[PDB]
Amino acid sequence: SKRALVILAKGAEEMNTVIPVDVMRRAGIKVTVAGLAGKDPVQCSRDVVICPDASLEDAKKEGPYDVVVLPGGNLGAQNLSESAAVKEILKEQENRKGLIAAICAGPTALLAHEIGFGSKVTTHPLAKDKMMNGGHYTYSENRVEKDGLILTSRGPGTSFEFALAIVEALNGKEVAAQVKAPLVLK
Amino acid sequence: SKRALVILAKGAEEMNTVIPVDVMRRAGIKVTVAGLAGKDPVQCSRDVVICPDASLEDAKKEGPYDVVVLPGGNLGAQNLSESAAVKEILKEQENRKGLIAAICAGPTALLAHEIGFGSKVTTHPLAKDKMMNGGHYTYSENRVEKDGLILTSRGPGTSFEFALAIVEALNGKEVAAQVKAPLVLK
């Protein structure tokens, strides 16, 4: 089976976090929800409290992963951006040519850690200016953008499309369609 | 402010749970995530573990609420259906003419507790036969159905529409539109 690391920090957007975790598990991906700050429960942006599977410290020992997923939430993304551990994980993933997927403010952590410069990306509209500081990416208003191994998306309302794009990248079109149908998507 | 009770049981569909909690809080609704079995963390259907704000036992003392929300997930909905506390909460809410909102398998708990018989309802397609046992409701394939104080919806992929319908019912159309826009919905 393919494996996903989802990095969960205080202030993460819980919708962005849970929709990809759940949809990936529906696709038979082995998902590790890793707490940035450790193993303790994480208070997300709208106060939903999620217990991580593991600390990031531990999870990063069990790499590598077929995708590393950065949820959004402004404050979550800021925490990701400030983390040396996240920098190392993303640099390794990029080096080994593994998928990196980021949604809403999440992609701003790519900028912080100098990941995938030159890629076409999207973000939440309110995160565009931050992402584009220095002009290191080319911006898109597509609901999901994939430029090689950099996959990005816009917001809670694009979370399903983002998650199904990860499923398609890892497990193929047929599995994505199979997982999609029971969700009752529009 | 308006107040929402979201009843969280083992096996709840985490997407169904988190999307309404988060969207309601965006709308300035005071939301209590209440654990059916107590205050301990709850393992949802795809293994996302959510820490409730309160036990249901405690939360039900702090009623009444402007809406009572039943997430889906087959096994979650079965737990809701079997609960005497849930029966009492829903009967009180119906009596006082307060909104009851249920998504995916969630509405089958309405059937278990003899709530809102005669209403037009929808469910997840795979829960239709259960819901319609005895012919006590009239079925709909609309993505969200509202028949007076019984509001129902179909699945993870209708979660945003379901949540925004609750917001519109409690806080009005303008607040629903305001909350909608930053979600980046299609």
Swiss-Prot record, chains A, B:
EC number: 3.1.2.-, 3.5.1.-, 3.5.1.124
Glycosyltransferase keyword on record: no
Cleavage, annotated site positions: D147, G148
Consequence the record notes for mutating C44A: Reduces protein stability. No effect on oxidation
UniProt keyword terms in alphabetical order: Acetylation, Autophagy, Cell membrane, Chaperone, Copper, Cytoplasm, Disease variant, DNA damage, DNA repair, Endoplasmic reticulum, Fertilization, Hydrolase, Inflammatory response, Isopeptide bond, Lipoprotein, Membrane, Mitochondrion, Neurodegeneration, Nucleus, Oxidation, Palmitate, Parkinson disease, Parkinsonism, Phosphoprotein, Protease, RNA-binding, Stress response, Tumor suppressor, Ubl conjugation, Zymogen
Cellular component terms per the entry's GO annotation: adherens junction; axon; cell body; chromatin; cytoplasm; cytosol; endoplasmic reticulum; extracellular exosome
Modified residues (N6-acetyllysine): K146
InterPro entries: Class_I_gatase-like (IPR029062), DJ-1 (IPR006287), DJ-1/PfpI (IPR002818), Prot/Nucl_acid_deglycase (IPR050325)
Effect of L8P: Abolishes detoxification activity on methylglyocal-adducted CoA
Modified residues (Cysteine sulfinic acid (-SO2H)): C104
Co-factor: note: Deglycase activity does not require glutathione as a cofactor, however, glycated glutathione constitutes a PARK7 substrate.
Effect of K128R: Partially compensates for loss of stability
Protein's name in the database: Parkinson disease protein 7
Organism for this UniProt entry: Homo sapiens
